[PDB]
Amino acid sequence: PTMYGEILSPNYPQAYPSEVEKSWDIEVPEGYGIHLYFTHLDIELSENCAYDSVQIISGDTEEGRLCGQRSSNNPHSPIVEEFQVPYNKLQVIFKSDFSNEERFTGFAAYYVATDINECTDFVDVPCSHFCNNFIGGYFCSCPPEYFLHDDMKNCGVNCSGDVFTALIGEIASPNYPKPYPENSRCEYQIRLEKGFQVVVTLRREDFDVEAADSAGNCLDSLVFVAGDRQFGPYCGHGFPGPLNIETKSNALDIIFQTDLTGQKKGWKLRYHGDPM
Amino acid sequence: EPTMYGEILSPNYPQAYPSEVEKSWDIEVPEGYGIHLYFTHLDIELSENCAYDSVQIISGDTEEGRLCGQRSSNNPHSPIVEEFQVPYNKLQVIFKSDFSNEERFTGFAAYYVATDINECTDFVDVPCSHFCNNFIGGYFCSCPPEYFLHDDMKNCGVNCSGDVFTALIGEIASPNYPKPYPENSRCEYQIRLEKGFQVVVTLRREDFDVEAADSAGNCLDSLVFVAGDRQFGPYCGHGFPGPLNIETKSNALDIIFQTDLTGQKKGWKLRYHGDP
Amino acid sequence: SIPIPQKLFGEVTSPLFPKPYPNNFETTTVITVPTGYRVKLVFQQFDLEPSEGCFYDYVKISADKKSLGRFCGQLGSPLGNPPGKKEFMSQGNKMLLTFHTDFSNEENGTIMFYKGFLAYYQAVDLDECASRSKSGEEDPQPQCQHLCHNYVGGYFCSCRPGYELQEDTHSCQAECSSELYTEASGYISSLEYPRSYPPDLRCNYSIRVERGLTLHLKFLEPFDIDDHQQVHCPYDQLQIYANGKNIGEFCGKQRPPDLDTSSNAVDLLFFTDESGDSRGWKLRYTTEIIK
Amino acid sequence: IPQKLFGEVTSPLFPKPYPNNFETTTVITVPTGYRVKLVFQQFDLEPSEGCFYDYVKISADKKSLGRFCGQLGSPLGNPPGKKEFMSQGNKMLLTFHTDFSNEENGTIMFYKGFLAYYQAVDLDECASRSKSGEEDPQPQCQHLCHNYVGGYFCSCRPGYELQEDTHSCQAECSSELYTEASGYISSLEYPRSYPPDLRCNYSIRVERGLTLHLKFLEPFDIDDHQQVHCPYDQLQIYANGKNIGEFCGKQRPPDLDTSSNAVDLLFFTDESGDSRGWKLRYTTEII
Numbered sequence A: 001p002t003m004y005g006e007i008l009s010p011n012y013p014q015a016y017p018s019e020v021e022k023s024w025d026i027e028v029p030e031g032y033g034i035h036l037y038f039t040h041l042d043i044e045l046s047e048n049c050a051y052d053s054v055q056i057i058s059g060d061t062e063e064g065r066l067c068g069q070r071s072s073n074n075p076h077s078p079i080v081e082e083f084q085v086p087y088n089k090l091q092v093i094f095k096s097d098f099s100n101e102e103r104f105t106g107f108a109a110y111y112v113a114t115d116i117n118e119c120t121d122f123v124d125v126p127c128s129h130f131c132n133n134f135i136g137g138y139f140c141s142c143p144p145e146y147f148l149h150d151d152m153k154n155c156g157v158n159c160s161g162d163v164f165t166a167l168i169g170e171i172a173s174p175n176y177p178k179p180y181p182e183n184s185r186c187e188y189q190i191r192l193e194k195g196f197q198v199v200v201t202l203r204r205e206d207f208d209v210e211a212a213d214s215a216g217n218c219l220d221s222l223v224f225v226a227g228d229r230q231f232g233p234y235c236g237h238g239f240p241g242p243l244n245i246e247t248k249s250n251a252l253d254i255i256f257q258t259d260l261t262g263q264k265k266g267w268k269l270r271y272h273g274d275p276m
Numbered sequence B: 001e002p003t004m005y006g007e008i009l010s011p012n013y014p015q016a017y018p019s020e021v022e023k024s025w026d027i028e029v030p031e032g033y034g035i036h037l038y039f040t041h042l043d044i045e046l047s048e049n050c051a052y053d054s055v056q057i058i059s060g061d062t063e064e065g066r067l068c069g070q071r072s073s074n075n076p077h078s079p080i081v082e083e084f085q086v087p088y089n090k091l092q093v094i095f096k097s098d099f100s101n102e103e104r105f106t107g108f109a110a111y112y113v114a115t116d117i118n119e120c121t122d123f124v125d126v127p128c129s130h131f132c133n134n135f136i137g138g139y140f141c142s143c144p145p146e147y148f149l150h151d152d153m154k155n156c157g158v159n160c161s162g163d164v165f166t167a168l169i170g171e172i173a174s175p176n177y178p179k180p181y182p183e184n185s186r187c188e189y190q191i192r193l194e195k196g197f198q199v200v201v202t203l204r205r206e207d208f209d210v211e212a213a214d215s216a217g218n219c220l221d222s223l224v225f226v227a228g229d230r231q232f233g234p235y236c237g238h239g240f241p242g243p244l245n246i247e248t249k250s251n252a253l254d255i256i257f258q259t260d261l262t263g264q265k266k267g268w269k270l271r272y273h274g275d276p
Numbered sequence C: 001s002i003p004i005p006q007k008l009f010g011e012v013t014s015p016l017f018p019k020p021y022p023n024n025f026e027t028t029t030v031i032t033v034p035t036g037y038r039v040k041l042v043f044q045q046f047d048l049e050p051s052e053g054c055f056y057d058y059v060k061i062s063a064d065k066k067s068l069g070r071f072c073g074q075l076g077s078p079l080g081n082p083p084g085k086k087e088f089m090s091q092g093n094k095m096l097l098t099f100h101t102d103f104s105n106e107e108n109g110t111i112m113f114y115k116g117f118l119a120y121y122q123a124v125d126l127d128e129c130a131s132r133s134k135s136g137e138e139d140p141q142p143q144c145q146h147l148c149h150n151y152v153g154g155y156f157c158s159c160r161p162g163y164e165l166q167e168d169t170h171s172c173q174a175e176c177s178s179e180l181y182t183e184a185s186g187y188i189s190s191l192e193y194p195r196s197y198p199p200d201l202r203c204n205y206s207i208r209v210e211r212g213l214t215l216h217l218k219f220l221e222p223f224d225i226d227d228h229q230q231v232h233c234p235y236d237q238l239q240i241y242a243n244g245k246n247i248g249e250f251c252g253k254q255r256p257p258d259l260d261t262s263s264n265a266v267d268l269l270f271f272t273d274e275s276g277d278s279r280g281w282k283l284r285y286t287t288e289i290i291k
Numbered sequence D: 001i002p003q004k005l006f007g008e009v010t011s012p013l014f015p016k017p018y019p020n021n022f023e024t025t026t027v028i029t030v031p032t033g034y035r036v037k038l039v040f041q042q043f044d045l046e047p048s049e050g051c052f053y054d055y056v057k058i059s060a061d062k063k064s065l066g067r068f069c070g071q072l073g074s075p076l077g078n079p080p081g082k083k084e085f086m087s088q089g090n091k092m093l094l095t096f097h098t099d100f101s102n103e104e105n106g107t108i109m110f111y112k113g114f115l116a117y118y119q120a121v122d123l124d125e126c127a128s129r130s131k132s133g134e135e136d137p138q139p140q141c142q143h144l145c146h147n148y149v150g151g152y153f154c155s156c157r158p159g160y161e162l163q164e165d166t167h168s169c170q171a172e173c174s175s176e177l178y179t180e181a182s183g184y185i186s187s188l189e190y191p192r193s194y195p196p197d198l199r200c201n202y203s204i205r206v207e208r209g210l211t212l213h214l215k216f217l218e219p220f221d222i223d224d225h226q227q228v229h230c231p232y233d234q235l236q237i238y239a240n241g242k243n244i245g246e247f248c249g250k251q252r253p254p255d256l257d258t259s260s261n262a263v264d265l266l267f268f269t270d271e272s273g274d275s276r277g278w279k280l281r282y283t284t285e286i287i
């Protein structure tokens, strides 16, 4: 395994021998992608590169197949063809049939190992809250008064000890997204400067609490207290309130009550401030 | 102990200097180096003939300079304000100040570097008779073709023996040719062939100019060929008097060239071949 | 808190973080990644004493030879100048951070509690090729004649088709020794035609076709080699060997005659001088058959 | 050669005429930080129009300077004669080439050869690196370097300190004393921009029984700000132990009268220099 390398056609830059099938296995260390690019391409031209060809296979799938006479169009770049993959290994197979109509000099290519930016390069991000990329790997981080769970990937809230002073921050139910603990009352407190208003956002889909009885009274409940004002109790699958909520208060108490049985996924939210 | 470079600053540079001082510095470079001493900063109490305060440059017994006053460099491309060059390996600098300073005077800042003496060119007297060679830290003499340097390491002298000619076809000329021949010398050149051959000497009628004979016709400077019993010469004057092709009828030939103290001329050149 | 020559990434915090920071404090921590790397960094939490123009407290981050940022305030508040999370990359391998705080953190004249900051820094690889200072590089020669390559940490160089890399791994010579030709027809041209040919060359352009054919050499225009009307080919020579024996040493301005060889093996030998003024030569070689 | 002042390089067998069919390369090497000067005393080769037959090829620092042939005096030849051939670096490559026949185009000819004399010389490192170009970092000096034989050493402008690398300089500007009756005090390199990152204590200490009169001159230019005065740069003035004003801006401060024999002007700079600075006349009176 290397961080860089050179691959030339047999007998470069002379004419290549006929009836050949040569293979190269590219390998870089863990957590690196590969950039493979061709500085020279002059191969026997056939439709679907039937007679002679140079082949790029990653794992089981054919990333490319090249043939023909071609030189770089950009005068600012020597690259003629190129490929980028999120994998740590590649395979290149050059094969030629028993005849050449003209003289074909083959090909000259090079590969380099690139860091995978695990946060951005994929659509799936392997961190619940915050992602940190570094050359050769990644690791996760969390928002105010959150503690990272054993799996090194997802973060979690504690039910007590937390006074929130950040202007923009997150709050979740304990164990989230795992089910919330039974027979507990979790109160989280936000305390801002007097001139600000706490505005609470939580996604309509990020809320699933034990449903109410037939009469509509929540058996498990979540409620926001702002002095005299009060929002809730909220329960059921799906947040019934609007996704953006104004409390009109600089200090807010969020209370979460559960009984002995009948638990569910739970909820998550993020808050910011607005002047008065 | 001798150095190739150095720094000299006024006491307490670049602050005001103390009064009633007389400080001295002794500059020293190794043998055969001159000294370049130059001043990067000059701000000293100004007096006529630098009477009150002064900085003084003495080489041996003689005053190479005396500076005082407020002065800055006029050339923006050079920091040098005053400078001196000397053919000696040692210098003395004496800074002295009287008991008062009316204004604030920052003193002076200077530096010295050792330079090679080009013994051939830097003096009017050149210590080589013929050719002079300068090198960094000394000199030595050299000489023209077939001259050997005399014991005194300075003056050269000509040799014209030790060379035995065995080639069938070869050349011989007078020393320094075509420059004038040396005075008070006897030059004998010797040709030695196989028994069966004859030395035949050719020399152009125009390639011969030796000091003419006296009124009576006796050559004062002469050239003569000795072939066993036969002898050709003495020859002298402007123009070769003999035929352009001369047959000696001998396989071994001695050519002798006699000159007196004064009355020199261009000289001569010749080429010889063999005949069975 | 992690300044070290051999380190990929690291953390730099305000003092006592997360506990609020003490007044009357100024500390400079310098990040150092190894040679040939840039320094990227961002702030997660950021809560400082705000001030119009950051007179009171601030974080001063400075790059190679320039202060990029001096910033203060809280993550969200518009009281001025928070970085929040923004990228701060260096050019060289060193990033100087400083944290300053005066005596009074308690504004309006009652106590206030300010936590600090969480700086995370990544190393990154720099693109040595793309720098492009074409002149003002005599001590190093960090740019290559034909092409260099950008990879993590270092960089290596390579030459255009038909050239060899010489010892310095920055410049290239010509190979032009075993230039083979076995195909039926073909084209042979002096290196980099019709531009001037490189000097100091020993070329053996060898043609070896299947036995039982005869070669036909047709020179094209232009044909430009340093010649001399007194004695021909003193500086540059283009010798042609056919069937083992020389058949002509050519140089000049008008092209040599179209040659018919009666041979299956020719060798064009090319000897150059130590200067290139003239352009070169190009030829089509074709094959014919016998009974 | 690792270490040599001077030397001789001759044609083979010199002075005896040189053999045919011969090519030899001799390389002169002076030590580091020296140039190579050389000239020819005697020069007698086989002449040829464009030096096809025989020649001396002298080349320095990846460039062939000369390829020369012929006799000292004779035309139709390219002789150097005595001309100077200096290198830039410390190496000079010489080569001598000769075919089989030097004795045909007339008839027999006897050609002696050549006498090359070479001196070493010192190179001017300063004028080499600082003459043109070079914005990237190079080992060149900040205020001034010095040219001397072999090596080079560096120095700083009046009132600056040389830092360890012996290439760059900061300002000292800490114990700047003034004990004379009158005088002038100016920020470093006035009216050019002042250096950044400074802690200056311009101390005036006159004989007791006098009062100091500080007169600021124009121009007076320090980075100021309309919101808060002196955030980046400050010019504090201490008199008689106590502060008497922290100044910055564009109009000069008022002429100050101290009633003190001991003043200290403290100068704090930021990390950039746009503004020019300040200058003052200090005078003494009696009490």
Ligand SMILES: *[C@@H]1O[C@H](CO)[C@@H](O[C@@H]2O[C@H](CO)[C@@H](O[C@@H]3O[C@H](CO[C@H]4O[C@H](CO)[C@@H](O)[C@H](O)[C@@H]4O)[C@@H](O)[C@H](O[C@H]4O[C@H](CO)[C@@H](O[C@@H]5O[C@H](CO)[C@H](O)[C@H](O)[C@H]5O)[C@H](O)[C@@H]4O)[C@@H]3O)[C@H](O)[C@H]2NC(C)=O)[C@H](O)[C@H]1NC(C)=O
Pocket: C204, C206, C208, C265, C267, C269
């Ligand atoms: C320009 O480039 C061409 C490239 O072909 C080159 O021509 C080649 O020159 C060499 C010079 O030696 C020849 O090689 C050998 O010559 C041997 C001659 O032996 C005499 O001369 C010796 C000195 O040269 C001396 O020491 C000996 O005592 C003796 O007096 C000869 O014995 C030998 O025969 C073998 O030939 C081939 C290898 O060439 C062997 O293998 C065959 O190779 C071919 C491919 O060419 C094929 O693959 C066959 O399948 C394979 O069997 C074979 O088995 C013999 O044992 C060899 O010939 C080359 O012959 C010659 N190549 C030609 C003429 O095509 C020029 O010199 C170059 N010019 C320059 C550099 O200026």
Ligand SMILES: *[C@@H]1O[C@H](CO)[C@@H](O[C@@H]2O[C@H](CO)[C@@H](O[C@@H]3O[C@H](CO[C@H]4O[C@H](CO)[C@@H](O)[C@H](O)[C@@H]4O)[C@@H](O)[C@H](O[C@H]4O[C@H](CO)[C@@H](O)[C@H](O)[C@@H]4O)[C@@H]3O)[C@H](O)[C@H]2NC(C)=O)[C@H](O)[C@H]1NC(C)=O
Pocket: D175, D201, D203, D241, D264, D266
């Ligand atoms: C700029 O630079 C100047 C000089 O370069 C500094 O001044 C020196 O430092 C201080 C402040 O001026 C002076 O110290 C004070 O000295 C007073 C008497 O002076 C003599 O005493 C000292 C000690 O014996 C001698 O070494 C000195 O040479 C003097 O001859 C004292 O009265 C002070 O003592 C204490 O007084 C009362 C107690 O009653 C306390 O309340 C005070 O706080 C003080 O501590 C004090 O010792 C010193 O004399 C100055 N001159 C020197 C050292 O030569 C500036 O400080 C400097 N400023 C900045 C901002 O950098």
Ligand SMILES: *[C@@H]1O[C@H](CO)[C@@H](O[C@@H]2O[C@H](CO)[C@@H](O[C@@H]3O[C@H](CO)[C@@H](O)[C@H](O)[C@@H]3O)[C@H](O)[C@H]2NC(C)=O)[C@H](O)[C@H]1NC(C)=O
Pocket: A147, A158, A161
């Ligand atoms: C959320 O709540 C948990 C409750 O468990 C809190 O964890 C507390 O963390 C401290 C560490 O600061 C634990 O101390 C232990 O010390 C030993 C000895 O050094 C060490 O080996 C252990 O690994 C652990 O750190 C403490 O036991 C624990 N508190 C309780 C009551 O169990 C904390 O507030 C939050 N979670 C975490 C992981 O910090």
Ligand SMILES: *[C@@H]1O[C@H](CO)[C@@H](O[C@@H]2O[C@H](CO)[C@@H](O[C@@H]3O[C@H](CO)[C@@H](O)[C@H](O)[C@@H]3O)[C@H](O)[C@H]2NC(C)=O)[C@H](O)[C@H]1NC(C)=O
Pocket: B147, B148, B158, B159, B160, B161, B162, B163
């Ligand atoms: C030049 O020709 C001659 C004869 O072949 C040789 O030169 C000789 O050189 C030596 C010095 O190396 C001289 O030696 C000295 O001679 C004096 C004579 O008075 C003697 O007193 C000393 O003790 C010393 O031996 C010698 O004079 C000189 N001969 C001459 C000038 O005829 C030499 O072979 C040839 N080449 C050179 C380079 O000299």
Ligand SMILES: *[C@@H]1O[C@H](CO)[C@@H](O)[C@H](O)[C@H]1NC(C)=O
Pocket: C107, C108, C109
């Ligand atoms: C108290 O805070 C207010 C904020 O508007 C400010 O106007 C006032 O000056 C502060 N009090 C004092 C004594 O500074």
Ligand SMILES: *[C@@H]1O[C@H](CO)[C@@H](O)[C@H](O)[C@H]1NC(C)=O
Pocket: D105, D106, D107
């Ligand atoms: C040498 O050759 C050239 C041209 O071949 C001719 O000019 C000259 O007369 C010849 N003979 C000499 C120089 O003795």
Ligand SMILES: [Ca+2]
Pocket: A017, A018, A019, A044, A051, A052, A096, A097, A098, A099, A100
């Ligand atoms: Ca094929």
Ligand SMILES: [Ca+2]
Pocket: A031, A115, A116, A117, A118, A133, A134, A135, A136, A137, A138
């Ligand atoms: Ca990674």
Ligand SMILES: [Ca+2]
Pocket: A182, A183, A210, A220, A258, A259, A260, A261, A262, A263
């Ligand atoms: Ca429940």
Ligand SMILES: [Ca+2]
Pocket: B018, B019, B020, B045, B052, B053, B097, B098, B099, B100, B101
């Ligand atoms: Ca005085």
Ligand SMILES: [Ca+2]
Pocket: B032, B116, B117, B118, B119, B134, B135, B136, B137, B138, B139
């Ligand atoms: Ca000398």
Ligand SMILES: [Ca+2]
Pocket: B183, B184, B211, B221, B259, B260, B261, B262, B263, B264
């Ligand atoms: Ca005489």
Ligand SMILES: [Ca+2]
Pocket: C023, C024, C049, C056, C057, C101, C102, C103, C104, C105, C106
């Ligand atoms: Ca503070």
Ligand SMILES: [Ca+2]
Pocket: C036, C125, C126, C127, C128, C150, C151, C152, C153, C154, C155
């Ligand atoms: Ca790199």
Ligand SMILES: [Ca+2]
Pocket: C226, C235, C236, C273, C274, C275, C276, C277, C278
């Ligand atoms: Ca040429």
Ligand SMILES: [Ca+2]
Pocket: D020, D021, D046, D053, D054, D098, D099, D100, D101, D102
């Ligand atoms: Ca010859």
